[PDB]
């Protein structure tokens, strides 16, 4: 059954995280320039603690989300994506458990403070929603979820909900790791729904949220076709130089990388100040 | 069928598409393809196919094409200039016309701007022709944006109803819609002509040592050519080497 359960945000630095394979083309030993929705380098990522007092807010999805969490407790189980998050519209529910992952798109009437019971209707129903009907999509596969860091990227383009993921070890406590690791495509779901908001589902809890932007990156593929490094071409003048020269190493010298231009502040129109109208109707409605 | 201002769209994917049954039919009055030959469709593969459908009158069928103007092209259903697809139409006088007039089919007559390609506008906002605000009230310089055809069985051909289906071929990614072409045995270590999901070329195929990831289907060179593919049936990775 549904039960009832704001704090200021914390921020951390995302040094070189949130990079993923932009397409399904194999490349190796090459530097490839691409334009896609990526998490900007050294951006401010919001650091949440859902269970501190319970505060697990609904967040905007915008144009795509970078999501990450570190834990061994397996508290984060899934996510909700949709608009009104009630029985009025279709909503996407992604929930993991011990053996599998279940993904449904239905008219869910979600709890005010939705979650998964640690011990249990259904394992994906009791604490999450009061009812569900008019299901249009169902998918079942294997689970999506020292210290274990799990990174995800969520995109929703042309009806396809695209999930990327990577699982790595970590020895940090209060931040995200440095170094480079690209996220691989996990699943492409042909759902066809609109997503404006999302929420994290916990089992009864720290996680990071960043947002993707239309950015140009230079990606380095090694001999095994693995992306090992990248340059954010709009980060700084040096990165711009690296992208311009298509190289991760720049020798001493002076390079022309771009051009500058002053943009117009306003628009002005200056026409003759005549007020008489052209006698077109006299042509169109002539008797003969 | 839908009205042209509120046209229907259906997505087609993950299937075998036989286009010859449509093209070789005697029942269609119009069958025009753009960006592709109608006789090569069965040899191609696409990522998605869209099927749009609606009713217009005979004289307006010419507006369903790239680079056209008119009330239908501008305010109801717009195609892109780089359109790839086929426009199919037939006379439906026997189904859509009624004695006394069929007023179910409607089109947009007034709009403040032209539609973008594949844009759909189903609003009924009163159109302001003058400088004075209408505030939702119809009258002088304030028009209702839609109008009916009123199809009748005794109308001239240009005023008879036509049912139109537009097939738009989306080519990007893995293909999901392919023509009914039969596959052959895989041949390696010899110079062959190959066709992998619509990807054609000539070369020698050998076992690859390239560590493709599960989602990757082919590799590319700096010349934008394919130098490795995943076989669509065995999921084996093959290298492509040009014939000596």
């Amino acid at each position: 059954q549904c039960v009832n359960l704001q704090l200021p945000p914390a921020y951390t630095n995302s040094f070189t995280r949130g990079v993923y394979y932009p397409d399904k083309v194999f490349r190796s030993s090459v530097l490839h320039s691409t334009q896609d929705l990526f998490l900007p380098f050294f951006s401010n990522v919001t650091w949440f603690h859902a269970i501190h007092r319970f505060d697990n807010p609904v967040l905007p999805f915008n144009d795509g989300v970078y999501f990450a969490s570190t834990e061994k407790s397996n508290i984060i189980r899934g996510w909700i994506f949709g608009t009104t998050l009630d029985s009025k519209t279709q909503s996407l529910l992604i929930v993991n458990n011990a053996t599998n992952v279940v993904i449904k798109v239905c008219e869910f009437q979600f709890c005010n403070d939705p979650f998964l019971d640690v011990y249990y209707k259904s394992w994906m129903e009791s604490g999450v929603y009061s009812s569900a009907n008019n299901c249009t999509f169902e998918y079942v596969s294997q689970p999506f979820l020292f210290k274990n860091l799990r990174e995800f990227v969520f995109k929703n383009i042309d009806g396809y909900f695209k999930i990327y993921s990577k699982h790595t070890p970590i020895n940090l406590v209060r931040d995200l790791p440095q170094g480079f690791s690209a996220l691989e495509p996990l699943v492409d779901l042909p759902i066809g729904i609109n997503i404006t908001r999302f929420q994290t589902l916990l089992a009864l809890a720290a996680y990071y949220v960043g947002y993707l932007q239309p950015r140009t990156f230079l990606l380095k593929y090694n001999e095994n076709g693995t992306i090992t490094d990248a340059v954010d071409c709009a980060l700084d003048p040096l990165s711009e130089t690296k992208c311009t020269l298509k190289s991760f190493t720049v020798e001493k010298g002076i390079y022309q990388t771009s051009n500058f231009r002053v943009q117009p502040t306003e628009s002005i129109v200056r026409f003759p100040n005549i007020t008489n109208l052209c006698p077109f109707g006299e042509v169109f409605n002539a008797t003969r | 069928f839908a009205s042209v201002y509120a046209w229907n769209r259906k997505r087609i994917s993950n299937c075998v598409a036989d286009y010859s049954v449509l093209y070789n039919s005697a029942s269609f009055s119009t069958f025009k393809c753009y960006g592709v030959s109608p006789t090569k469709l069965n040899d191609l593969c696409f990522t998605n196919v869209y099927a749009d459908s609606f009713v217009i009158r005979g004289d307006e069928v010419r507006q369903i094409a790239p680079g056209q103007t008119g009330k239908i092209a501008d305010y109801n259903y717009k195609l892109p200039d780089d359109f790839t697809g086929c426009v199919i139409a037939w006379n439906s006088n026997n189904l859509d016309s009624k004695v006394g007039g069929n007023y179910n089919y409607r089109y947009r007559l007034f709009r403040k701007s032209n539609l973008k390609p594949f844009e759909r506008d189903i609003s009924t906002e009163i159109y302001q022709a003058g400088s004075k605000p209408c505030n939702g009230v119809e009258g002088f310089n304030c028009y209702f944006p839609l109008q009916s055809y009123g199809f009748q069985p005794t109308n001239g051909v240009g005023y008879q109803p036509y049912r139109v289906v537009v097939l738009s071929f989306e080519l990007l990614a893995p293909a999901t819609v392919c023509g009914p072409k039969k596959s052959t045995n895989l041949v390696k270590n010899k110079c062959v002509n190959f066709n992998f999901n619509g990807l054609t070329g000539t070369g020698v195929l050998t076992e690859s040592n390239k560590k493709f990831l599960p989602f990757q289907q082919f590799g590319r060179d700096i010349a934008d050519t394919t130098d490795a593919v995943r076989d669509p049936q065995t999921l084996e990775i093959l290298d492509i080497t040009p014939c000596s």
Partner: antibody
Amino acid sequence: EVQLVESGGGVVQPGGSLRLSCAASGFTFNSYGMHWVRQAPGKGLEWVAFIRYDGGNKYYADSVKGRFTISRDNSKNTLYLQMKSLRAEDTAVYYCANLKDSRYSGSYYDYWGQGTLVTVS
Amino acid sequence: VIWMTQSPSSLSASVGDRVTITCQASQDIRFYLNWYQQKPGKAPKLLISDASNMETGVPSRFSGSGSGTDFTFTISSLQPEDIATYYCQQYDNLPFTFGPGTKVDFK
């Protein structure tokens, strides 16, 4: 915790210009799209403009379109509104707001500022 | 531009009385409508979103419903603290619009 504070309001002449700003704190400002809303003395609420979280797409009311510009600085959590060719009709209290919106901004929480009076005369 | 109207523009009621406010749209906006309450000197407060969903902290005496072009806001039992001007707002299509505003006075 969440605060929105407008500033830049004052008295200007017709045909002149005024730059408003709103300082945001207590929430992740850069993840939310923001709105401007104005209310003249004795009048109801009039929607002015909307800007997306990234600061790319911008939307305006027809009553201000071509004269008002909306922008945001995500490094300072500050929302801006640059008003040119101000008219007497533009006299109103201007608010910065985060309006609950399930379709465009995806904003789940509804916040309003204090309101700053702009006078044109 | 979707035009919004409200009726009555003004009503008077006492404590314990039932107050109903009608809002209409010139276009079909499904259920994408907000209801706001404003008191003099203060910014508007959101009470209802998506036609009928109540905001956290809003008294159970407040409710609303409707779909398409016809929406209703209701106060089951008017309190002395509920004397305010109410607005409806559509967010189906940009630009967003507010209604004229309905003033509820004390009888």
